[PDB]
Design a protein around this nucleic acid. Structure first.
Ligand code: MG
Ligand code: MG
Ligand code: MG
Ligand code: MG
Ligand code: MG
Ligand code: MG
Ligand code: MG
Ligand code: MG
Ligand code: MG
Ligand code: MG
Ligand code: MG
Ligand code: MG
Ligand code: MG
Ligand code: MG
Ligand code: MG
Ligand code: MG
Ligand code: MG
Ligand code: MG
Ligand code: MG
Ligand code: MG
Ligand code: MG
Ligand code: MG
Ligand code: MG
Ligand code: MG
Ligand code: MG
Ligand code: MG
Ligand code: MG
Ligand code: MG
Ligand code: MG
Ligand code: MG
Ligand code: MG
Ligand code: MG
Ligand code: MG
Ligand code: MG
Ligand code: MG
Ligand code: MG
Ligand code: MG
Ligand code: MG
Ligand code: MG
Ligand code: MG
Ligand code: MG
Ligand code: MG
Ligand code: MG
Ligand code: MG
Ligand code: ZN
Lengths: 122, 86, 105, 52, 134, 135, 50
RNA sequence: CGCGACCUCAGAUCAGACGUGGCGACCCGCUGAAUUUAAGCAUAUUAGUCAGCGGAGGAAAAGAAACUAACCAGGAUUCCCUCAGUAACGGCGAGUGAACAGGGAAGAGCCCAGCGCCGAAUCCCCGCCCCGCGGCGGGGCGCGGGAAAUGUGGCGUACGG
RNA sequence: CCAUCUAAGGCUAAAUACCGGCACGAGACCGAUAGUCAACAAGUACCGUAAGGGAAAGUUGAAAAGAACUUUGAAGAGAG
RNA sequence: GCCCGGGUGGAGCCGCCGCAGGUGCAGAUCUUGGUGGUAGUAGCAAAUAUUCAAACGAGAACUUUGAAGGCCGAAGUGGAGAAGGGUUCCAUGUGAACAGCAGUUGAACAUGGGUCAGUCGGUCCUGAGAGAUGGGCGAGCGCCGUUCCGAAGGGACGGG
RNA sequence: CGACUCUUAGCGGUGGAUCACUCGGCUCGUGCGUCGAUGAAGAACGCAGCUAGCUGCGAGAAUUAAUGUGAAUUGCAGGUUGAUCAUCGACACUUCGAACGCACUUGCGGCCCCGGGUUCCUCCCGGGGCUACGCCUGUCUGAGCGUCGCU
């Protein structure tokens, strides 16, 4: 009676689309019944069918994008949807490597004169 | 003649609805909004009227993306991960 | 208008002084924050002196104060060289160093 | 206006004088009772107990 | 006296939080004490009220020695309804009268798995607190 | 120079502000050129500029711009400072060498007007009341 | 006017839909302070701007 | 005439990137009044203030002397106390008005061009292989392409090298 | 004659500022003609072509237990 | 100014020693709100005009039907549109408020309905004009300019 | 006597003062200090069984998934393997808007790939993906009685 997202994950796309179509036709029948005058039991089911449709569509989209990004993880250029989505400012900062690397003159200087741990007697 | 009699002749409008700010201030003949200056890239905003500035400022509308980033910020813009399943 | 007798005054309140007023209601909070930062740095540098690098002896540069002795900005290169301290190693072992100061005496 | 003169400063010698006067007056049964404190059973109003 | 600087003692703030707490805070707020036997058995003092626990009414016009089963918990109105406390209106139909949980004591609980988990957690925490207090 | 943009004369007010066509701009033509180049190329950052020629009615400047998102500079440690967001539109904020000259920045008795950040900062610091808590 | 634009007709439709009175089950909720619809507009009195 | 370099300049729905607009309490660059005071008023004052324009950050700007001083000398910038309503400006009228030294908060110093020496010893990008890749990096292989001698990298900058 | 720097290239945290924003704490403050214009479906209703202007409005009761039923009147509205 | 008594009321309040102030109203053509006399008064008088019978209904000068007498008199008090209005249109129901008397009636209120296009218009063209690029000017948002300081054609019969 | 007027009191109206309440302000302080072509701020239109406003949301439309919690939501109906709330990291997110094929009527296109007509042979219908300006590095195609070199 209740369609849940837990057991829809293992199923593949074809029967998911078939179930979506069945839910859509059931929703259309519910709407026409509401217009022509139906029981409160049929009126209440409209929300549950809408939410079941939402669940099916959400599962479809989630699996599709998971597979897409899994397939694209091994490539240099990714679609903007699959690229990380943080603030525009943080997206154009220097990355960790080019933020950490140092000129070899400074490398030489800090190698020759490192900071020392020390204390002075009172 | 300059008053009540003249008031009967007005039957064509000067402004219409702006396509950007939504107010009825789009002068047709000048093709320009008198509230936001729609054809211009930058919005019309003078700070000699703080009331006008506060009528249509950032905090007035839906804030449908800034509201979300305000709470995304409280976790360091965590992304690409999910909580541990049951 | 002048009263019977008194001082001629020139109050400098002919501008919009009420817009630029610096109240000091955050003075205790500022002191608390400075303290906390001070102790945080002192804990951060574990055995090192809390005050910082040692500094040098200098004379105040004026007839009014030339009898007094301050703490200077840093030791100069002549003093470091004659004391046998390298200018680069002094900073990392705790000696404040500046190259601007001369030594006339 | 927020820049009213909220705070006042008192001389350190005057503060110490006030503290001394309060301490001295705390040792007189008449003044302590007139303050309203019920000390009719107290054995000795400069009440001192050990450090335990 | 409260010393934590991050928790408020402001009357208006506390009242606002109380009157706009969400439902899962309402569940916490409407808790009522256990009977003496249950308290001694479970080493627990208070429990949030559930739908079909039974109750002794301690204060109000309906105080008495009648064990009454709760019919439903109206969290929006901060009220529970007991199957025996009720009054008849003008037309003769009988309606339940609201009773606040704080004026209510449980006779015995509905032992669900979550309920017994909560009871065991409360008892364990109280016992470890007492042992630390030793 | 710079003549006052007023309708015919009509700079209404007291006679001390009646001047029209002998006024001088506060910024140099080099700074104006740098700001024009920066405005036209909004994706680059202005580094410096130099004079290459002039005549009666024109002055010619060549201005260096840097593309901040090119790897050739983003991977070079000593020039990646310009890629920081803080250095946007230096010519518009008067931070280039030519722009700085007009701000009256300096050290010594000649430049007391800009003790602190700038003229704005000095004027602010000198024109507030420090109403202390105790007074 | 019989001649009208699509956006004008849509705005008119929304304004007309907004003009109904409140449902009778509103006023006897618990946390309710509404007695009637105070935003009702009559075509003779207020002229919709535009 | 043709073919080939280089220079200068075009065309692209060429491959990959970047800017626009908003908020604007605090900050930076311009432009910038008149009410008002002077018991009138034009210089002054209001005020480099309001209004106007542009550009940012979490702070901004400033900053390691073409400095202060004249002392037995101090030593980047910034902020507070004081210097001081003082030196000074001003129909010397009304009014305006800093700085050095001194005590503190904090405290951090550095890098190029040039001059020269190193077989351009330098950098970017495409293809394949290996690592992890939700801040696209490291290693290797490419008689792969390009930039660059109209000058990339290492040493090196006034405290000398 | 002395003194002191080395301009016309560049980077740099901390102390400092903050009537906007997020999240908090407090008060010798105001207590519905007060305090924000706005304690409430308030920048809302409403006015102006437009720039823009801009309100009024808190309190049953512990719990609706919000007056069944009879009677006069068409009803509002009354008596029990 | 205050203290008691009586009544109403239903949850906080005052005395003394100090401290602090947004601390005392008859006026300001004071601000906001409320209420009087005037006063059951002025008035409900521009464009000739209404009458009889019946029905419905608690209720009829005003509603509906029938009859009579009138007016608009085709440059209309007729039949349709443009602009503007935006559901005022239609049916049913109600008579609290509104329609400055009344209403059984309404453009009021409450429930529901109603606008169908290859050919009717928009959509296309250009007019007076408006307005980008190139260019120029401009501290700057931007402004001038519309062929003028432009490498301004992405088209085609045909042939290979 | 009666009417009318005046005064005082009781009661009843009218009105909404006073008092007592306060999920609201004002002021000070603290920590953080984060928007946008991967499409912001703002606007429009829609979305509930009964829904006008406010609020929430976006054709998955008073919300989907996931995690925590653990038996409700409620004005009336209807129906523990997890109701409702909260958190929020997955997913989705209509039209305008810097707003981006050209214009602003939602009018008119162009190119490529799919599904219907065809059984590609072209139209027609539907679906999907591109088609703004400036600018940087590189690539390709070019122009020049610009400077040259061999014929
Ligand atoms: Mg702007
Ligand atoms: Mg006198
Ligand atoms: Mg005197
Ligand atoms: Mg605690
Ligand atoms: Mg100037
Ligand atoms: Mg100069
Ligand atoms: Mg009208
Ligand atoms: Mg005067
Ligand atoms: Mg005058
Ligand atoms: Mg003057
Ligand atoms: Mg001046
Ligand atoms: Mg300004
Ligand atoms: Mg900007
Ligand atoms: Mg930012
Ligand atoms: Mg800086
Ligand atoms: Mg130097
Ligand atoms: Mg100094
Ligand atoms: Mg003095
Ligand atoms: Mg004189
Ligand atoms: Mg001055
Ligand atoms: Mg000093
Ligand atoms: Mg110190
Ligand atoms: Mg070199
Ligand atoms: Mg130099
Ligand atoms: Mg320098
Ligand atoms: Mg700098
Ligand atoms: Mg405190
Ligand atoms: Mg009141
Ligand atoms: Mg009341
Ligand atoms: Mg009460
Ligand atoms: Mg007060
Ligand atoms: Mg009065
Ligand atoms: Mg009369
Ligand atoms: Mg007609
Ligand atoms: Mg007709
Ligand atoms: Mg009709
Ligand atoms: Mg009437
Ligand atoms: Mg036909
Ligand atoms: Mg133009
Ligand atoms: Mg009376
Ligand atoms: Mg709706
Ligand atoms: Mg869910
Ligand atoms: Mg759950
Ligand atoms: Mg058109
Ligand atoms: Zn507009």
């Amino acid at each position: 009676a209740k369609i849940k997202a837990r057991d829809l994950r293992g199923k593949k796309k074809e029967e998911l689309l078939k179930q979506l179509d069945d839910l859509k036709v059931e929703l259309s029948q519910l709407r026409v019944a509401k217009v022509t005058g139906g029981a409160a039991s049929k009126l209440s089911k409209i929300r549950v069918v809408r939410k079941s449709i939402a669940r099916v569509l959400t599962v479809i989209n989630q699996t599709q994008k998971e597979n897409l990004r899994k397939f694209y993880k091994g490539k240099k250029y990714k679609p903007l949807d699959l690229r990380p989505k943080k603030t525009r400012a943080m997206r154009r900062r220097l990355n960790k490597h080019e933020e950490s690397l140092k000129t070899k003159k400074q490398q030489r200087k800090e190698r020759l004169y490192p900071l020392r741990k020390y204390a002075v007697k009172a | 003649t300059k008053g009540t009699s003249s008031f009967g002749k007005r039957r064509n409008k000067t402004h219409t609805l702006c396509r950007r700010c939504g107010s009825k201030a789009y002068h047709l003949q000048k093709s320009t909004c008198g509230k936001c200056g729609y054809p211009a890239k930058r919005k019309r905003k003078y700070n000699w009227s703080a009331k006008a500035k506060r009528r249509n400022t950032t905090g007035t509308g839906r804030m449908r993306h800034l509201k979300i980033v305000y709470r995304r910020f409280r976790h360091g813009f965590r992304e690409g991960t999910t909580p541990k399943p049951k | 208008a002048p009263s019977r007798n008194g001082m001629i005054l020139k109050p400098h309140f002919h501008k919009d002084w009420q817009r630029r007023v610096a109240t000091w209601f955050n003075q205790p909070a500022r002191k608390i924050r400075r303290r906390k930062a001070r102790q945080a740095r002192a804990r951060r540098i574990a055995p090192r002196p809390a005050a910082g690098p040692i500094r040098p002896i200098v004379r105040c540069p004026t007839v009014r104060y030339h009898t007094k002795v301050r703490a200077g900005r840093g030791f100069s290169l002549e003093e470091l060289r004659v004391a046998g301290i390298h200018k680069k190693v002094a900073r990392t072992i705790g000696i404040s160093v500046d190259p601007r100061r001369r030594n006339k005496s | 206006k927020t820049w009213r003169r909220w705070h006042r400063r008192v001389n350190t010698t005057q503060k110490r004088y006030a503290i001394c006067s309060a301490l001295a007056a705390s040792a007189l049964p008449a003044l302590v009772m007139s303050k309203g404190h019920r000390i009719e059973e107290v054995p000795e109003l400069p009440l001192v107990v050990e450090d335990k | 006296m409260k010393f934590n600087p991050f928790v408020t003692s402001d009357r208006s703030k506390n009242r606002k939080r109380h009157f706009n707490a969400p439902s899962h805070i309402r569940r916490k707020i409407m808790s009522s004490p256990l009977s003496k036997e249950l308290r001694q058995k479970y080493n627990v003092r208070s429990m949030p009220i559930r739908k079909d626990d039974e109750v002794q009414v301690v204060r109000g016009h309906y105080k008495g020695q009648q064990i009454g089963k709760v019919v439903q918990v109206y969290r929006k109105k901060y009220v529970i309804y007991i199957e025996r406390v009720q009054r008849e209106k003008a037309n003769g139909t009988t309606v339940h009268v609201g009773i606040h949980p704080s004026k209510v004591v449980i006779t015995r609980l509905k032992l669900d798995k979550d309920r017994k988990k909560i009871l065991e957690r409360k008892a364990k925490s109280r016992q470890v607190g007492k042992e630390k207090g030793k | 120079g710079r003549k006052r943009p007023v309708p015919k004369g009509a700079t209404y007010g007291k006679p001390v502000h009646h001047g029209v066509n002998q006024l001088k701009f506060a910024r140099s033509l080099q700074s104006v050129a740098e700001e024009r180049a920066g405005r036209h190329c909004g994706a680059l950052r202005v580094l410096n500029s130099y004079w290459v020629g002039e005549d009666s009615t024109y002055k010619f400047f060549e201005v260096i711009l840097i593309d901040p998102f090119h790897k050739a500079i983003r991977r070079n440690p000593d020039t990646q400072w310009i890629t920081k967001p803080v250095h946007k539109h230096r010519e518009m904020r008067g931070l280039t060498s030519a722009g700085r000259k007009s701000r009256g920045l300096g050290k010594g008795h000649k430049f007391h007007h800009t003790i602190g950040g700038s003229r704005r900062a000095a004027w602010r610091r000198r024109n507030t009341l420090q109403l202390h808590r105790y007074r | 006017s019989s001649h009208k634009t699509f956006r004008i007709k849509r705005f008119l439709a929304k304004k007309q839909k907004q003009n109904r009175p409140i449902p009778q089950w509103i006023w006897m909720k618990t946390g309710n302070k509404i007695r009637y619809n105070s935003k009702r507009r009559h075509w003779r009195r207020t002229k919709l701007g535009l």
